[PDB]
Amino acid sequence: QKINPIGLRVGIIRDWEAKWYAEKDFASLLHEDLKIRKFIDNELKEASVSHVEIERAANRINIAIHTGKPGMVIGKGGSEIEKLRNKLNALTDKKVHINVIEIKKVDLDARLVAENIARQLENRASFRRVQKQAITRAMKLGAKGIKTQVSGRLGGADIARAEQYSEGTVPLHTLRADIDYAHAEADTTYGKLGVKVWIYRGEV
Amino acid sequence: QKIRIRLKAYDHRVIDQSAEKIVETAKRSGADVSGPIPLPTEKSVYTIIRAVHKYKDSREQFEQRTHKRLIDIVNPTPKTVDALMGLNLPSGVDIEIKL
Amino acid sequence: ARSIKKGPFVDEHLMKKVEAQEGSEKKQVIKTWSRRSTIFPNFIGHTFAVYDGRKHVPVYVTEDMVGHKLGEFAPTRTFK
Amino acid sequence: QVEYRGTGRRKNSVARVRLVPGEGNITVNNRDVREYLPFESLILDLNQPFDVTETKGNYDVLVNVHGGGFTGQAQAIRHGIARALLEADPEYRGSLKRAGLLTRDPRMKERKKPGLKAARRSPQFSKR
Amino acid sequence: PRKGSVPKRDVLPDPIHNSKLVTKLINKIMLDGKRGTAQRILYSAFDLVEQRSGRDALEVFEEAINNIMPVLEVKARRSNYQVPVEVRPERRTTLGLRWLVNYARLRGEKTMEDRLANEILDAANNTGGAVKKREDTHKMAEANKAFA
Amino acid sequence: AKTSMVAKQQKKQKYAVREYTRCERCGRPHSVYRKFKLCRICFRELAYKGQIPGVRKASW
Amino acid sequence: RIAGVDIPREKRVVISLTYIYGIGTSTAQKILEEANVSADTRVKDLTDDELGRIREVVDGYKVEGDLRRETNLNIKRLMEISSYRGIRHRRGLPVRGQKTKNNARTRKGPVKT
RNA sequence: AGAACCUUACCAAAUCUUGACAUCCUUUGACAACUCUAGAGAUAGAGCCUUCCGGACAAAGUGACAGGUGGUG
RNA sequence: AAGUUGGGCACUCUAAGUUGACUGCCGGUGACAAACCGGAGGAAGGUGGGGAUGACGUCAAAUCAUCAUGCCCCUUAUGAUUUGGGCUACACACGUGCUACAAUGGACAAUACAAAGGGCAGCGAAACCGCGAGGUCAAGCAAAUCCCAUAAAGUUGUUCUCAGUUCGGAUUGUAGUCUGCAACUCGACUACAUGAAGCUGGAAUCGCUAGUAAUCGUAGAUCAGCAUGCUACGGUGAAUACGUUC
Numbered sequence A: 001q002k003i004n005p006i007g008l009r010v011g012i013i014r015d016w017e018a019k020w021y022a023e024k025d026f027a028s029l030l031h032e033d034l035k036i037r038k039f040i041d042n043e044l045k046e047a048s049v050s051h052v053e054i055e056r057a058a059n060r061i062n063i064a065i066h067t068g069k070p071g072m073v074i075g076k077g078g079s080e081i082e083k084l085r086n087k088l089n090a091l092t093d094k095k096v097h098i099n100v101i102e103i104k105k106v107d108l109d110a111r112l113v114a115e116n117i118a119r120q121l122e123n124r125a126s127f128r129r130v131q132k133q134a135i136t137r138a139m140k141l142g143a144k145g146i147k148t149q150v151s152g153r154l155g156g157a158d159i160a161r162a163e164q165y166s167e168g169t170v171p172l173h174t175l176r177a178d179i180d181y182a183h184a185e186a187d188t189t190y191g192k193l194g195v196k197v198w199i200y201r202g203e204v
Numbered sequence B: 001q002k003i004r005i006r007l008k009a010y011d012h013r014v015i016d017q018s019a020e021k022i023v024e025t026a027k028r029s030g031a032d033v034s035g036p037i038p039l040p041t042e043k044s045v046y047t048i049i050r051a052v053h054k055y056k057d058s059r060e061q062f063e064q065r066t067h068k069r070l071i072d073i074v075n076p077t078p079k080t081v082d083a084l085m086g087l088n089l090p091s092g093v094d095i096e097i098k099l
Numbered sequence C: 001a002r003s004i005k006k007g008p009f010v011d012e013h014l015m016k017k018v019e020a021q022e023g024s025e026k027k028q029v030i031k032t033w034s035r036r037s038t039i040f041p042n043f044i045g046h047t048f049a050v051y052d053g054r055k056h057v058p059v060y061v062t063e064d065m066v067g068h069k070l071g072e073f074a075p076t077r078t079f080k
Numbered sequence D: 001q002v003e004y005r006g007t008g009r010r011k012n013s014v015a016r017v018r019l020v021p022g023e024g025n026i027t028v029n030n031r032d033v034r035e036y037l038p039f040e041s042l043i044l045d046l047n048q049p050f051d052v053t054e055t056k057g058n059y060d061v062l063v064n065v066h067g068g069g070f071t072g073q074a075q076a077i078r079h080g081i082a083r084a085l086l087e088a089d090p091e092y093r094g095s096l097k098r099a100g101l102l103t104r105d106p107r108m109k110e111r112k113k114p115g116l117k118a119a120r121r122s123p124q125f126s127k128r
Numbered sequence E: 001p002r003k004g005s006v007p008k009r010d011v012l013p014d015p016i017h018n019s020k021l022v023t024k025l026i027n028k029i030m031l032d033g034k035r036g037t038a039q040r041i042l043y044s045a046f047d048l049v050e051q052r053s054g055r056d057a058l059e060v061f062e063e064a065i066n067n068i069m070p071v072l073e074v075k076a077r078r079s080n081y082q083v084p085v086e087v088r089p090e091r092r093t094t095l096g097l098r099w100l101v102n103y104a105r106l107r108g109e110k111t112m113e114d115r116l117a118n119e120i121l122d123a124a125n126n127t128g129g130a131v132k133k134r135e136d137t138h139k140m141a142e143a144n145k146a147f148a
Numbered sequence F: 001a002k003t004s005m006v007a008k009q010q011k012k013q014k015y016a017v018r019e020y021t022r023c024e025r026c027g028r029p030h031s032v033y034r035k036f037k038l039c040r041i042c043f044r045e046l047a048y049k050g051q052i053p054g055v056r057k058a059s060w
Numbered sequence G: 001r002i003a004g005v006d007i008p009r010e011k012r013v014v015i016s017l018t019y020i021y022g023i024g025t026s027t028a029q030k031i032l033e034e035a036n037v038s039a040d041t042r043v044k045d046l047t048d049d050e051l052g053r054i055r056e057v058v059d060g061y062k063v064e065g066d067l068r069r070e071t072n073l074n075i076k077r078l079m080e081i082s083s084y085r086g087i088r089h090r091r092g093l094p095v096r097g098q099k100t101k102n103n104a105r106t107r108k109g110p111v112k113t
Numbered sequence H: 001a002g003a004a005c006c007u008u009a010c011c012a013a014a015u016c017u018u019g020a021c022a023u024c025c026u027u028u029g030a031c032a033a034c035u036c037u038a039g040a041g042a043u044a045g046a047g048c049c050u051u052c053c054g055g056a057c058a059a060a061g062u063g064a065c066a067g068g069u070g071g072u073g
Numbered sequence I: 001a002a003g004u005u006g007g008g009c010a011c012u013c014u015a016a017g018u019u020g021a022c023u024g025c026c027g028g029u030g031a032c033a034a035a036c037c038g039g040a041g042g043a044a045g046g047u048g049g050g051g052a053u054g055a056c057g058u059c060a061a062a063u064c065a066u067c068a069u070g071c072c073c074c075u076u077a078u079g080a081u082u083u084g085g086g087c088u089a090c091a092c093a094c095g096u097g098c099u100a101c102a103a104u105g106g107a108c109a110a111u112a113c114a115a116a117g118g119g120c121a122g123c124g125a126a127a128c129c130g131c132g133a134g135g136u137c138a139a140g141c142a143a144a145u146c147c148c149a150u151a152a153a154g155u156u157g158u159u160c161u162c163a164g165u166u167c168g169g170a171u172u173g174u175a176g177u178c179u180g181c182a183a184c185u186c187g188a189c190u191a192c193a194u195g196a197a198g199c200u201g202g203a204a205u206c207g208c209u210a211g212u213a214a215u216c217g218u219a220g221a222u223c224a225g226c227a228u229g230c231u232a233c234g235g236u237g238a239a240u241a242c243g244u245u246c
């Protein structure tokens, strides 16, 4: 019923996560990127991998991993980054160059907050306290607005419902607004619990 | 004695900046450039059924627009050719050179 | 296929099976699933058990049956 | 020479219209107007700006027109003629504006909406 | 549920006769946008009536419309009764042309030009189907004259 | 889609006309675009995520 | 009367020829041109020699009873061989692979509610 | 947003039981693009025979396992 | 022959950056307002036209058959491979459409004017072969260049002359073309021949306020082949709105 804000804003004030051009092997390149992203997500679950950007030029693949824990991905001796690069080169015939971008405030990143709340739900925390503290810390860190929602079999009840908490401004109809949105799923013993988070850090 | 450069990109911003960069490089290398010439943009429209099941009457319309830019180099020089071949454009834009 | 420049279609296995025992007058019944095979003059006087979906309907080939497909004499659907 | 150039647009029809001192003859794409346009109503619409400005027969018109159909091209030519008369004499601005001939008719063909047979026509509805 | 009244369109005069009424009659006759067919049909009908009457086509057509144009109609109001009410001049022209064309299309002639010519001639003589329609409208308005 | 069905689509067909397209992300056989090799649903999801270069919501 | 069937006196010659079974507009035109007769001329206002030439051209076109008998023989052959087309002819259903769930009236007759 | 085969789940017949498909464990090196016989085909039987980097990738057996467009919107 | 090329970038056009409409300005109203009515200029005047964008919630509304998943069930079978069938059945009822019932028309002859799209082993010109669907060879083109691709309705003439017809083109026979391995179940198209119902549709019921309705064609996705469907494009182009009691 509500348009995905990322989908609404892509190409207006938000750039694509895949930056390249093709005319003949568009499908091959797209699915190469998809499998690369799936591999990165499966391999860096523990790391706070906010997102990944993929570009390609001169038969090379530039990967930019925006994460909140660059130490885990790089490694103390830079061994983890080299291992990831080698695995990606093995998977894809092309040559891959990987960069890591630090996120200073992981609590203002929609995806990181969504994954954190989903992890707490899997650990069987309180679906109300988790959202309350998440919104509190996001708001105290200077966010102009934040909205959190969790839906499913909340406390294990037979009847599934959804609950949300807001604070500040989340103008989903403003196309100017740079609203970050994320959805995550917790695999609780009762089933899938869907968490959604919207963050609006203000005009930029 | 002309050299054609065809740039194609999904973003008019990136295509314009790349065209300006290559024009500046050619002018620095000395050759004379006529352009940039903006060729018509090619827009491909995709119509998807919004719902996963039934609900034929609700659709969503996406588009892919590729902008096209043309550059003509009139007085080529080895320096101009070397500079053009060594210049690195952003990954978004696709460049084709016809000598 | 249908176009004249291409010869009338017929399964190679079916054609060779029919050609087998051509000299002998004790021609037997040929089980076939090839509803798509064309009927050549060579088939006249033969008995083909043609699969119609669940069972092989026997069909006896005569001169007037030349040019039709083996499926035209093995109905697939049942009504009343 | 003494050419008065102008451009007119209507629907998808663009007409480059030149006015020269003449006897009132109009040539469109190297063809006579009364042969190019299937109806005399279109010719009268073309002449309408001349009637308003009160300079009927004082100019010969040369038209390079493409796009649209015959009515669209006729009205694009009329717009071009009005603009050319403006260029020739600014004193005709009041008369042309009062006649409403300087306005570029903004009406275009509305897009088709998804889920509808046409721009507005919707599928036949049937309760039950 | 309506903010107000919308501006009305203004058609151009007939190219040969220079008559807004002739232009509007052409628009009425036109079907599926075949403006040319409408124009040729109307001009042929005008020529036929001119030939058969020896009088100006515009004059006879004006007489016909004057004969088939109503003055009163019966519009329901409410406890609910139809009330006679004067007809606006533009409703007069609209109804005259509409009835003229509608009852022309029902005539027994072979071609629409013949049908329209005969209908305008009968209306000018005050003995046509459109005339009958106007007469019925006027008498029922008189019948309900009390409620005015 | 069924895993066996996807495997059979991926495997080589003895004939050549017997080849059909499936969405390579989920396996849906219907409404699969050639340019992306994706079904409409996966296409919409990835366009929303912004992972299809140059594919943005259209309006005109 | 050409080919043993009377043809409309009023009609033009070609349109009257079409009334002969097995004659269609293309073959009426071919016959009329082979036998040099004007298309405009009506059959009633037609020369005896012209009529004779028309008959001579027509006789070799395999029309009327011969054509009807040939078609009936073909239909009987396909019925007798027990073909799918023959079975559908016998049952009065569409023969050329139409759908009978709906829209089969031209073969099934009027609706039997 | 494309039912002659495929799509295709439903049905008849012919068929397989670590399996059409994923990883792991044992062991081998070519695993085979090509051909020929029976087959409606899957398949099976003869050829053959060429390809492979600590070590690639691929096959023979068994078990963890796989598989389900099966049910509950 | 041809913007065909020499020559030009004036005009059109393409597309980046900008100007542009904001109740800005002037009259009356109005509570010193907010707003309304009119006028000027202006391509556009009062959110200009159209799109995207759909609040808290309702219907335990739809989807375990896109995908994912709690729980249950089968594991030499509810799993799996293959040839054939079925999904196209047919006494029938309903919805949505295409073509018609004709003279504002049918046939034939000549002759104008668009937009938006697609093309790699794909789009396929020219020519020649056939009545035609198409075939032979083969030019141009990874595109503002070549091709799909000549728009049709339209205009101007000849003819028919009010009827189941020169309307209509369903059904059927014969002869073919193409794609595909293969068109019987079960593809499209062409030629010859046949020539069904149908003479404007009961109760009832639907869409639309302008470049709209109606009408005419054009292109694309899916696709080896197959469109009256869907999604887009333009050509011609109406009638009407008194008004808000129902």
Ligand SMILES: [Zn+2]
Pocket (backbone or CB within 6 Å): F023, F024, F025, F026, F027, F028, F038, F039, F040, F041, F042, F043, I066
């Ligand atoms: Zn998918």
